[PDB]
Amino acid sequence: PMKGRFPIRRTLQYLGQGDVVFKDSVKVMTVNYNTHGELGEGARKFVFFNIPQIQYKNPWVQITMFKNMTPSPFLRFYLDSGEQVLVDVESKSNKEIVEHIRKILGKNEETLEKEEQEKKQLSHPAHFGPRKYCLRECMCEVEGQVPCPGLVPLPKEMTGKYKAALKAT
Amino acid sequence: RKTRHDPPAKSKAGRVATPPAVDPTEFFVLTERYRQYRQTVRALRLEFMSEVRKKLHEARAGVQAERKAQEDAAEHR
Amino acid sequence: RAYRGGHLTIRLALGGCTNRPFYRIVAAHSKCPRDGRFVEQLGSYDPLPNSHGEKLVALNFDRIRHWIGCGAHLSKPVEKLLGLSGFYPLHPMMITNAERLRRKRAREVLLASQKTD
Amino acid sequence: RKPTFMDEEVQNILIKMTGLDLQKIFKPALQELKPPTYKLMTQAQLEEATKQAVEAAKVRLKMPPVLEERAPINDVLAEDKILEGTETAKYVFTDISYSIPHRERFIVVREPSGTLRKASWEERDRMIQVYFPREGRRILTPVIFKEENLQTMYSQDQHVDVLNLCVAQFEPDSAEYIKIHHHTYEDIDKCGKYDLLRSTRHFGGMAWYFVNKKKIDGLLIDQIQRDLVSDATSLVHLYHILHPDGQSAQEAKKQGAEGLHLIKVFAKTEAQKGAYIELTLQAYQEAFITHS
Amino acid sequence: PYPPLLRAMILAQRQKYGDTSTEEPMLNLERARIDPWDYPAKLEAKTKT
Amino acid sequence: LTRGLFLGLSRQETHQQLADKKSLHVVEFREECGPLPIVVASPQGALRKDPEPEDEVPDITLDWEDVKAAQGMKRSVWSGLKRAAT
Amino acid sequence: MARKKVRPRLIAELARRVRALREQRERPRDSQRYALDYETMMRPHSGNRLPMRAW
Amino acid sequence: SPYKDEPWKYLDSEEYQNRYGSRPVWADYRRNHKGGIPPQRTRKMCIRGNKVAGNPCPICRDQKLHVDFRNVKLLEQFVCAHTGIIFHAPYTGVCMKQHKKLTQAIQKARDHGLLRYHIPQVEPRDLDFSTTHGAVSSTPPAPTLVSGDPWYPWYSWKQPPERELSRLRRLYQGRLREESGPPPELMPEV
RNA sequence: CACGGGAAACAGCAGUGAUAAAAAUUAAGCCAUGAACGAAAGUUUGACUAAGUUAUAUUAAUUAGAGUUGGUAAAUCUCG
RNA sequence: ACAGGUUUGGUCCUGGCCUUUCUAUUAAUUCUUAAUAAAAUUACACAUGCAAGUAUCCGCGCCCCGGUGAGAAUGCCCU
Ligand SMILES: [Mg+2]
Ligand SMILES: [Mg+2]
Ligand SMILES: [Mg+2]
Ligand SMILES: [Mg+2]
Ligand SMILES: [Mg+2]
Ligand SMILES: [Mg+2]
Ligand SMILES: [Mg+2]
Ligand SMILES: [Mg+2]
Ligand SMILES: [Mg+2]
Ligand SMILES: [Mg+2]
Ligand SMILES: [Mg+2]
Ligand SMILES: [Mg+2]
Ligand SMILES: [Mg+2]
Ligand SMILES: [Mg+2]
Ligand SMILES: [Mg+2]
Ligand SMILES: [Mg+2]
Ligand SMILES: [Mg+2]
Ligand SMILES: [Mg+2]
Ligand SMILES: [Mg+2]
Ligand SMILES: [Zn+2]
Ligand SMILES: [Zn+2]
């Protein structure tokens, strides 16, 4: 787009390139940050940039931002078990915040790979049906098998009218 | 087809089903083969029920499942 | 859709083309239409012979045995196919049909011999 | 303890033997093309990009495993005399499951005679392609693999395409795979066309086929005429490895030759065109020292 | 005896883990006993346990 | 249209001038040639060893037209028609 | 399902009570229910004919 | 067409060089239509019997251009040298009949190695090659298989007892049929 | 809604009136699928299958007619 | 949209309408054979035929299939 300070962050590619996936126990991320002082430049840049990337890959996690109540910027992760994860961000940078969050509460590369390997199993290559869920519609189009009657007409010996005609006489 | 509230046809109201021809020597061996086949398929059904039980138990409280349930808890702390 | 009852049945759904049948071996509810909603697809069945001349049939034995242990009923042609595959014992209907065919060949050769002299 | 194609002592020689040619590995093919990307780098970043390209070329040069001919499948599971003529065609049954390898699938065929046998290799491979299609494979036998079209494509020096198509289509332990690869390897040393596979991923296979078939006369002279002596000493080392008991191998041990002299003992003892090999080595010797 | 393909399934299953025992696998019929069609059924309500 | 087309075509920047003005190598990355570092122009003169500031988030002037084209939202029937050759 | 504008249907539930009462009050006694005409093998109550193998 | 056997002879001839030269046969052809945007579907077939329908097609106005798999020079003009895709009918200008024939000929010449195309590097199908599994190796035969006995004892036809036959015949009176003994083992032909 | 009140029900397959610019056979079977029943041989299924009719649409050909010719936009000579 | 026609003595800008592309119905003209897919005006009323049977009685199923889009902003996805 054109409107906005950074039009790039409002694109599907930017939202998809941010790889931060929370665990199933993660429910709430409450970020508290200030709008003044040189200490909180990293927290402000984190709120400006990385919140959309985290939100895109965690749609069910509620993220709430708060401004100018606590003098120290921090994050509070509310889990399913009730444990509150307190993350102090005073001089951390924008990339350091993301790396710290992924370290403390996130999903490993192998964990993501096993989920996607399970997901690709649902679509099965040998199944038949519509093009949305299956690769083949009718089994005629397979090379070695009988062609589709709407493309190559079948011989008179395989048509049902000739079989009825021969039985009639 | 037909529904519960529609009356039957007149030509079939005065009609009863007629059983077909019966061959005794074929029918007896056919029935003993039915019983011998049904006992085998029943045993296979029991075998499949047992294997499903084993797989579901190993998926819920399996030796591999408990290992994950413990290592995740350790890494969390 | 909502049903009052019924049972899970592994059957054949005729999804194909005119004068060119093709069955999908699928596990579906008993009260649903033949080509309607199903639970999970298992395999394929090809009624016509291909160029090489084999009748090609697919079975997903693992899911089939899983569902049958779960309580899936079976249809008669599915039983014939499974018995031919070797996963299940041969259906007696095939045996009695083979014996009937044997008797038809015997009477055919008898009449052919008697009509020639 | 027979040496194997996947052994380290063979693979380390074969990698250096093939060599690295980026302009050939990363070549513009005939696929759909997109506008390029431009970014500005320093000298160190350019060198890092080049070494990353080399590491990618390693994966591009990943060698295909060459295997022996597989044993034909001939076994009967059951025999039902009742089904002698109830069916005209035969029923082929495939076991389909994503969690099982394709080497463990049960492909069982009921003959019209009434027996249940295991499907042979050509039927099994065809059924795997039918129910698990991968790009580059054809269910039916392609016409291109015939001896007329194969010669036609050879005349247009497309042996790299021949080898890639054969690898994609056939299974390395099948019969036609080995037959066609031996046919291309006999054409390549009949015509001296080793240039096509100089830097591809199929050079090691051809070299390992020649060390098996004792056909080195053309390869050695080609490597010498291409000013490659590190690619000749390693080749004769492969020959000695795979033929330990031989007059060429034992003479090297008894004499203690250097890399340059390892070729002379081979070309005197067991080489067939020894005169040409010696003449080529003499021509290289009288020129390399004088020019450099 | 098991059906041919199913029996071969177990013969391949244990061979992968390395069971060298070549014993012939049987299928039990102890719990496969069924009543004939002439056996009448009960008409009382079934108690869910 | 002609005046603007000629002005824009004349105000182009050659890879050689880009390399001259930024003292860095211009490397082309073809999609077909994989990760191969194809070099198109060399920065003749003093080659700076200091690398360019890598922007984690680029501040570029994007356009909703090309964003729609990239996201596949161009459902107009006038975009993917078959037309005559050059 | 559950909406804000769900109408409180009362006749549909009153019909349930009416049919429940009529099921017990007008319960067909098994005597006339299983009565049988021995000439036509025709059940006077339900309206079904007997199978021919039971003739 | 005088050749009738060797299509590339015309392409190598001089009457092709003086007429078309180094340019493709469809370079000078311009399609007439109703607006500025041509229809997505070109003419179906322009040569109906002996009549030519108005302005003919680039390969199709001259009878010395034979569409075939042997003349790679003619087929190369309709295949892009860079992208390797077949140009469509609105791109070239031929009637749809010659377009389908061109596509079929291009594919059939590709399947013979005369016309080049992309050959990607495809990994082997199997990660691990193991023939020792029971799927491809022989299995130990069954005791009933080695003896010649069917798989299950009830597969064969056994003669029913006379008492049970009489019991069946008593209950199924009026519905009786002719008896049949053991069936023949082998089916004779016609 | 369906106790009850209007009131005698094709929003099943075919077909008939009115209406509308809108026009398929008042035909054959369960041989093969799905469903129901019966322990079962087996029965039924206007679902379904095999068909009849329709340029509504794609393909092969046994076939040649329609539109247009001022610009957009390919293409006109002579008459009133 | 790769656009084009169209305001004015005339130019530029703004701005609407139309044309060029694809699909579905009806109408007109014409029309030869096959294959495949689909048959689409009506929740207006129906003459007539068939569409729920099975079975040693009990029982089981009897808008299940199939038909339609009137009402509902109804609803999609998820515990
Ligand atoms: Mg149909
Ligand atoms: Mg009844
Ligand atoms: Mg109502
Ligand atoms: Mg009505
Ligand atoms: Mg009704
Ligand atoms: Mg009707
Ligand atoms: Mg009417
Ligand atoms: Mg109509
Ligand atoms: Mg009419
Ligand atoms: Mg009419
Ligand atoms: Mg009928
Ligand atoms: Mg049926
Ligand atoms: Mg039946
Ligand atoms: Mg049409
Ligand atoms: Mg005039
Ligand atoms: Mg004005
Ligand atoms: Mg009409
Ligand atoms: Mg419906
Ligand atoms: Mg309303
Ligand atoms: Zn089809
Ligand atoms: Zn033409």
From Swiss-Prot, chain H:
<dbReference type="GO" id="GO:0005763">
    <property type="term" value="C:mitochondrial small ribosomal subunit"/>
</dbReference>
<keyword id="KW-0687">Ribonucleoprotein</keyword>
<comment type="subunit">
    <text>Component of the mitochondrial ribosome small subunit (28S) which comprises a 12S rRNA and about 30 distinct proteins.</text>
</comment>
<dbReference type="GO" id="GO:0005739">
    <property type="term" value="C:mitochondrion"/>
</dbReference>
<protein>
    <recommendedName>
        <fullName>Small ribosomal subunit protein mS40</fullName>
    </recommendedName>
</protein>
<dbReference type="GO" id="GO:0032543">
    <property type="term" value="P:mitochondrial translation"/>
</dbReference>
<keyword id="KW-0809">Transit peptide</keyword>
<dbReference type="GO" id="GO:0030054">
    <property type="term" value="C:cell junction"/>
</dbReference>
<comment type="similarity">
    <text>Belongs to the bacterial ribosomal protein bS18 family. Mitochondrion-specific ribosomal protein mS40 subfamily.</text>
</comment>
<keyword id="KW-0597">Phosphoprotein</keyword>
<feature type="modified residue" description="Phosphoserine">
    <location>
        <position position="1"/>
    </location>
</feature>
<keyword id="KW-0689">Ribosomal protein</keyword>
<dbReference type="GO" id="GO:0003735">
    <property type="term" value="F:structural constituent of ribosome"/>
</dbReference>
<keyword id="KW-0496">Mitochondrion</keyword>
<dbReference type="GO" id="GO:0005654">
    <property type="term" value="C:nucleoplasm"/>
</dbReference>
